[PDB]
Every structure is written in C-alpha cells, then in structure tokens.
Design a protein around this ligand. Structure first.
Ligand code: 0R6
Ligand code: MG
Ligand code: MG
Ligand code: MG
Length: 539
DNA sequence: GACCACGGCGCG
DNA sequence: AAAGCGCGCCGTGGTC
C-alpha cells in the first residue's frame, strides 16, 4: 500500500496497537487507517483519534472503548471479526480469522489496518446469499458492539472499603479451617494443592476414591467427591468449607478492589462478542458474569456492587428463559400450556425435590431445582441425579422419564435437531445463528454423544442469547433518552443504573422492552428489582 | 517475570 | 465423578 499522510478519508478501516489487551487500561501505541490502496499512519495516535468518525476494522469495539475513555464519542462500525464469528463461531481470535480469511495478525498498526480492509472484503463476499446471517449482523451484532462499548467504558461502582474489611474476616475463618484440617491430617501440607490433598485423603487416611480426573486419571478431590465422602471422615466437611472460602477470597474479595480505575473510580469489564460456540457473550478482565450469589458468603460479595450516589441499580432477569425458548422451538403443547397458564417448572420440580406442596416452596428450594431442571434437560445421567439428590437410582431414573414424558415433543425436537445437524454439519438458533458440530458423525460413541449434547443445547442457549442481544439493542437508545445507563449483561439478565427519581420508570420500560423483544409461542416474563446494591436489586 | 495444562469452581 | 451445556479465573506444578 502507498503511504499517504494522516488523516485518512471517511470509510477507511482502522488498525491500532494497544500496550495491553484491555482497552480501559491500554496505552494507544499506534494508529493507522487504510483505504483506496493507501495506508495512513498517525504521527500521534491520541490526537489522531479525534479525526475519526467511526472505528471500522478488527476489534473496532476496543478502539471505541478507549476513545470513550478519552471523552471522544467514537462509535464502532463494521468489524470483520463479527462477520467471521457469524460464519462460524469457532472464529474467535484475530490471529485465527486472519490465517483463515486472508492475512496475518501482526503487531503493526498499518498492517492491521490493511488487514482489516482485506478481511472485510473477503468475509463480506462470503456472507453473500446468507440473508439470515446478514440480518443478524446488521440488526444485532454490529449495533450491539456500540452498546457494549458504552457499557465497558461506563463500568460499575464497587464498595472497596467493604471488601477490604470482608477480606480480614474471611482470612481469620480460613485460618480456623486450615488448622483443623492439619490437626485431622496429623501434619500440615499445602491445602491448596489437590495433589497433596489426594495423597492425604486416599493414601494416608485411606478414604475410598470415588472418581478420577479427566486428563491424567488422578483420584479426584472435587466437591462432588467430597460430598459423597462427607460422612466418611470429619476432615471432609472442613475441606469443603475451606474450598468455598478460599475460592471466594482469591477470586473476588482480594482481586476486585485493586481493579478500580483511577479516572472513573469504577470497575470495568470487557464484553467479548466473539468468544462462545452458542452466541452468548462472555466477560473478562475481570469476569463480572460470575460474581457470587448462591451461598451466604457469596451474597455478601455481591453486595459490594453498588449504584452511584443519587442513583439506583435496576436488575432484570428473564423468567425460566431456556424453558420458554424450548417451548417455542419444540412446539410442545404441554410446555406451551405451562407458560400460557403462568406456571413455574422450577417451582414444580422443587415441590417434588423437597416433598412439599407448590405453595410451600421457598425461593431457596426453587433455586435448587434449577440445576436439576437444566441438568435433566441437557442429558444428565440417573446416576448423577441420584447422587446429587441422595435418592435411589430408580427414583432418579423415574424422574427423568416423567420429565420427558411430560413434554413429549421435546425428545422429538432433539432427534430432529441431531439428524439435521448430521446432514448439514451444523445446528442453528431461531434466528439462524450456526454452530458447526462435525463430531455428530464421530465413530467413537463417547465422543459422538458428547457432541450430541453440545449440538442440541446450542439452539436453545443460542436463541436465548439472540433474544437478549436484540433486547439490548432495542433498549439502549431508550435508556440514553432517559439519562439511565446499561452496566452489565449476565446472559439473561441486565443490570442498569438510573437516577433515583427515574428508577421506577426505567424499570417499567426496560421490563416491557425485554418482554416484547420478539413474540414467541409463549409469553416472555421478566422479573425486575430496584436497589442500592446488586443483591438488593434482584431481591 | 511469563507460559502452559490441569483440576477445580464461580456464574448463566 | 457420574451422558447436562456455555463460559473465565484461581493456584499448583512444571517449565522457560
Ligand atoms: C441461587 C441460585 C441459582 C441461580 C442460578 C442457577 C442456575 C442455572 C442455570 C442456568 N442455565 C441457563 C438456562 C437458564 O434458563 C438460563 C438463565 O439462568 P437463570 O436466570 O438462573 O434461570 P432461569 O431464567 O431458567 O430461571 P429464573 O426464572 O430466572 O430463576 O441459563 C443453565 O443452562 N444451567 C444452569 N444450571 C442455579 C441456582
Ligand atoms: Mg432467568
Ligand atoms: Mg439469570
Ligand atoms: Mg479448563
């Protein structure tokens, strides 16, 4: 490409190099643009940012986030990563997409700009005739990248002093647990080392091994194994408690306070748009889609996520979302009827689990039923179900039989999905998002059946993802108009931040936008709460 | 300092 | 662990 002076003409593709992968923390080291067989290299990257009308190119969102950080309203536009990811969601990295579709991902901005241009041309041609993928790109993914950029640049407020205080308390409890474990073992060891623990449990204390690890065949010390050994030796419960506390401390309590951005005073995640096989987003650096909530200490951690003073958090979560999606995809009359009648399958399974009438099912019971319902749907064994519930194998087998007998078109939908997947090589969501699953044709049963479970999960999980993404795209401009902010997405949940006086109106509007995103054979229902912290906003 | 595979586990 | 699926991050053990 012929070198031409900065600035480039409009519509040019950008290339940029960051000192580190996270745009909220990166120094913009270089910036370039490419168009019309010219490459324009910026003498001074930061000032040159002010010349662009939009970020168009590989990882466009990341440059947009950095621009927003610097107070520039630079929206992301076309991005070849999004085209590639829609063609095949195994296309997750610029390194791989470049190799597959026409170049090499290097560490120079000019080359990245020229690459973005070249890859866009080739990938755009590959989507020709692919109207459903094209619709996903234009109506969902491309606009969503703009929304995600704003979310990343906005961040979420964290009560740092609270977490610092919590760390000191948890450390003291961890010490009590570890000391008791060493007392019971007869000697100290590194309790964080599963290899050392294996030797203590199975060689020294002579507890029965229960399961093996996947890749190396060691005797497993997983929580499931420890659960089954809970009554074999007093050390086991102590280990389980130690595991819970150290997991929460090392992953959330300690690292999060150190990630507050100096300028914004907030915590900023990255919403990765081309990272999953199903069409879900992911979140990283830090992952804010896995903040604890299911246990008491976990709930204490979630309380650290708070609204700006004078504002409130609004949390909205789709009800029974993958079951509703399954009703639509499978067309099962019974499943459809459940939702037309306003019933709750989580509550119903909890009723059976705890042997109480539906009226007596408390929120804790209902929530315990969730992993059971989705586990069973997506192929969990009777052995596992019986172990997890401490019921006879025969009763677990019966539950699984009844579950599918209750919704007889579900198995029919699964079989149709797998047959079509074997023939075409891919399965698809309601909107036509694809996932290639070649191992449906594997000659090894273990491999093939694992591939089958992946394959029939994808249309359900992926359709739910498509719906949430479309809802985000519809909702964002409404929030801007009301002076509210979109902060986080957690798969079927959004967390927003609204001025106190407007929080009620924002809640109502967001609920309606999400429920009406795309009418199905069953209604979509959204649960919405408002509060000063993330825990209180989900009730 | 950094990379990795692994086991393990937090969320959806 | 076990026929649930989808993620990212932690510490260990082992390099490099
Ligand atoms: C306390 C607590 C507690 C919280 C969450 C869960 C869970 C879950 C799961 C979720 N999923 C997939 C399928 C779900 O439809 C989807 C959204 O997860 P949730 O919002 O937790 O479940 P839901 O929308 O089905 O039910 P709600 O009505 O929102 O409770 O993610 C899934 O595939 N597998 C799961 N185990 C277990 C315990
Ligand atoms: Mg939900
Ligand atoms: Mg949820
Ligand atoms: Mg792994």
């Amino acid at each position: 490409l012929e070198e031409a002076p900065w600035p480039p003409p409009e519509g040019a593709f950008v290339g940029f190099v960051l000192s580190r992968k996270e745009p909220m923390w990166a120094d913009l080291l270089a910036l370039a643009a490419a168009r019309g067989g010219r490459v324009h290299r910026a003498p001074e990257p930061y000032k040159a940012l002010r010349d662009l009308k939009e970020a168009r190119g590989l990882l466009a969102k990341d440059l947009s986030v950095l621009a927003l950080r610097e107070g520039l309203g630079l929206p992301p536009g076309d991005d070849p990563m999004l085209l590639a990811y829609l063609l095949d969601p195994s296309n997750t990295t610029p390194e791989g997409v470049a190799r597959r579709y026409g170049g090499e991902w290097t560490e120079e901005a000019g080359e990245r700009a020229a690459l973005s241009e070249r890859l866009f041309a080739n990938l755009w041609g590959r989507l020709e005739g692919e109207e459903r993928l094209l619709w996903l790109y234009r109506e969902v993914e491309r606009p969503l990248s703009a929304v995600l950029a704003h979310m990343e640049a906005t961040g979420v407020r964290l009560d740092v002093a609270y977490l610092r205080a919590l760390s000191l308390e948890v450390a003291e409890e961890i010490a009590r647990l570890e000391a008791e474990v060493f007392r019971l073992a007869g000697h100290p060891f590194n309790l964080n080392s599963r290899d050392q623990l294996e030797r203590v449990l199975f060689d020294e204390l002579g507890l029965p091994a229960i399961g093996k690890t996947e890749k190396t065949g060691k005797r497993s010390t997983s929580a499931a194994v420890l659960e089954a050994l809970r009554e074999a030796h007093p050390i086991v419960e102590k280990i389980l408690q130690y595991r819970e506390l150290t997991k929460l401390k090392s992953t959330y309590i300690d690292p999060l306070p150190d990630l507050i951005h100096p300028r914004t005073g907030r915590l900023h995640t990255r919403f990765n748009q081309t990272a999953t096989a199903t069409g879900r987003l992911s979140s990283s650096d830090p992952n804010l889609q896995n903040i604890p909530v299911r246990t008491p200490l976990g709930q204490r951690i979630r309380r650290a996520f708070i609204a700006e003073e004078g504002w409130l958090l609004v949390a909205l979560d789709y009800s029974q979302i993958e079951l509703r999606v399954l009703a639509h995809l499978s067309g099962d009359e019974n499943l459809i009827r459940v939702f037309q009648e306003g019933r709750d399958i989580h509550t119903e399974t909890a009723s059976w689990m705890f042997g109480v009438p539906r009226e007596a099912v408390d929120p804790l019971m209902r929530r315990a039923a969730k992993t059971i319902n989705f586990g069973v749907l997506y192929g969990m064994s009777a052995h596992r179900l019986s172990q997890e519930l401490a019921i006879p194998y025969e009763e677990a087998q019966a539950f699984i039989e009844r579950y599918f007998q209750s919704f007889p078109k579900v198995r029919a939908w699964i079989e149709k999905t797998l047959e079509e997947g074997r023939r075409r090589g891919y399965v698809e969501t309601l909107f036509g998002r694809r996932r290639y699953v070649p191992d449906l044709e594997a000659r090894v049963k273990s491999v093939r059946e694992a591939a089958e479970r992946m394959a029939f999960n994808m249309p359900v999980q992926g359709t739910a993802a498509d719906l949430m993404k479309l809802a985000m795209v519809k909702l964002f401009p409404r929030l801007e108009e009301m002076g509210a902010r979109m902060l986080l997405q957690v798969h079927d949940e959004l967390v927003l931040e609204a001025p106190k006086e407007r929080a009620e109106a924002v809640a109502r509007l967001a609920k309606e936008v999400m429920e009406g995103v795309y009418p199905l054979a069953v209604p979509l229902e959204v649960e919405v709460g408002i509060g000063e912290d993330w825990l209180s906003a989900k009730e």
